[PDB]
Design a protein around this ligand. Structure first.
Ligand SMILES: Nc1nc(O)c2nc(CNc3ccc(C(=O)O)cc3)cnc2n1
Ligand SMILES: Nc1nc(O)c2nc(CNc3ccc(C(=O)O)cc3)cnc2n1
Lengths: 263, 263
């Protein structure tokens, strides 16, 4: 969908769980969510990542009916009021399916096709783009952490292909903050360029995460300059897309980095 | 002076030319300048770079008597009111000399000892630290730009040594924005790690410069995320000290970068 290699692309985050709003009942949450997306697009987002379940640590599981009730109305308004690609942040195949029928472009799966056995064939079925993100429970790795991550991608890519997903539709993401402690997260960021060998576009998400908070012990929103650092280093290491809360600031840093390393 | 390699050090900029103040007469400018330095120290500056002549493009030349009248009172108050190292941003040996007699730690010479034949022996005489910055008039280079820069450092380092300057006192700086157009500035930033071969600590200054403005065409103060990008890339490339207007923001990015690459 994006012209990979020409520049860095920015994915803005739109969470529409109840905790995401001042008033989690308010019938105006739908319009608030849409205003937030209009703002991110004006700040220069290339795609919006919409989620109805939070994968942020110790948020609760949402059943897929509930998840769809949160995202379906937002997708409909986005699609009519805003000319922007949408990504659906879900690991559930039934959620993805409904989203894709409504014209969402990409499934962002934070379990990398492993949590729902139907996810790969849904992606194939709609010819969707997918982000395959590395994830696991706990922080144990018997091999080199970057070797494990690459092994995991190989298996997920083969699952995708067995269901007729085209290679050009896949984006990989190393899953900062997922199945990884501080040191492992640092190590993955340091070695991120090793993922370029697999030949696929890379997506990175660090924005406001605890890996930054451990270096910069301020409240999440005040970690922006850490996130900008990882955006910048990521692009130098081959990152194509960054998933961020603060679209304008990360885009400005990304343009500066693009001007130095992209041809 | 700094424990090079342990972390990135931050140099805050303190310009005390008349244009630097709301009211360039006001007898309170001295106290305003000192408040600005107290602020930078609280934001985490490691050293303050004080200048009484602006080397920003198309600012006028200041004679050294005038330059000293601007900086001497500021150095005296800094030295009594603030426990922070000071750098004197001057290419004039007589200015440097007076500053060094008052307890300034480093001479920051934006002509890399070439504009004043006495500068090297002044540095030697006081056992000062020096930043030797690459500079030239116009933008012509017959050799590879990084080869020219390194050749220039070799000559300036030999001048310093002939006057008994110790090797451990020298810091090099490639002089972004000086004798270099957009493309050359980009190229130097891209190749900055080649300067690590000379074995010396490196200082970088990009903050608010036109090289960033050409990628991010906003007013100088609004170029902060570009500057943060160059701080981050610089540290990865071996930079030890960054010279910045916005101390807190660059320090936060530098700590994030230090946590990823420094051992
Ligand atoms: N593709 C993709 N890539 C991500 O990196 C990501 N992150 C989240 C949010 N996840 C986390 C994880 C950990 C932490 C913490 O340690 O603080 C915070 C948030 C949600 N969707 C995501 N999708
Ligand atoms: N050591 C050191 N290193 C610097 O990089 C530096 N820069 C300035 C300020 N110089 C400039 C140059 C060019 C530009 C523009 O193109 O906009 C702006 C400011 C003053 N002292 C400096 N000292």
């Amino acid at each position: 969908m994006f012209d990979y290699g020409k520049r860095t692309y920015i994915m803005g985050i739109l969470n529409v769980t109840p905790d995401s709003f001042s008033d989690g009942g308010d019938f105006n949450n739908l319009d608030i969510a849409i205003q937030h997306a209009k703002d991110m697009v004006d700040q220069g987002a290339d795609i919006i990542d919409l989620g109805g379940e939070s994968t942020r640590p110790g948020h609760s599981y949402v059943d897929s009916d509930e998840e769809l009730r949160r995202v379906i109305p937002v997708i409909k308004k986005l699609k009519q009021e805003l000319d922007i690609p949408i990504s659906i942040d879900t690991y559930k195949a039934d959620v993805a399916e409904e989203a894709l029928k409504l014209g969402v472009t990409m499934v962002n799966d934070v379990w990398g096709l492993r949590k729902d056995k139907n996810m790969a064939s849904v992606i194939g079925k709609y010819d969707a783009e997918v982000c395959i993100m590395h994830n696991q429970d706990g922080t144990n790795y018997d091999k080199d952490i970057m070797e494990s991550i690459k092994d995991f991608f190989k298996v997920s890519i083969e699952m995708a292909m067995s269901c007729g997903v085209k290679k050009e539709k896949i984006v990989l993401d190393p899953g900062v903050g997922f199945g990884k402690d501080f040191e492992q997260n640092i190590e993955v960021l340091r070695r991120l360029n090793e993922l370029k060998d697999l030949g696929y576009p890379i997506l990175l998400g660090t924005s406001r995460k605890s890996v930054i908070g451990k270096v910069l012990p301020v409240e999440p929103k005040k970690r922006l300059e850490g996130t900008i650092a990882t955006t910048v280093l990521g692009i130098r290491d081959g990152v194509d897309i960054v998933r961020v809360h603060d679209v304008y600031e990360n885009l400005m840093a990304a343009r500066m980095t693009d001007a130095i390393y992209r041809k």
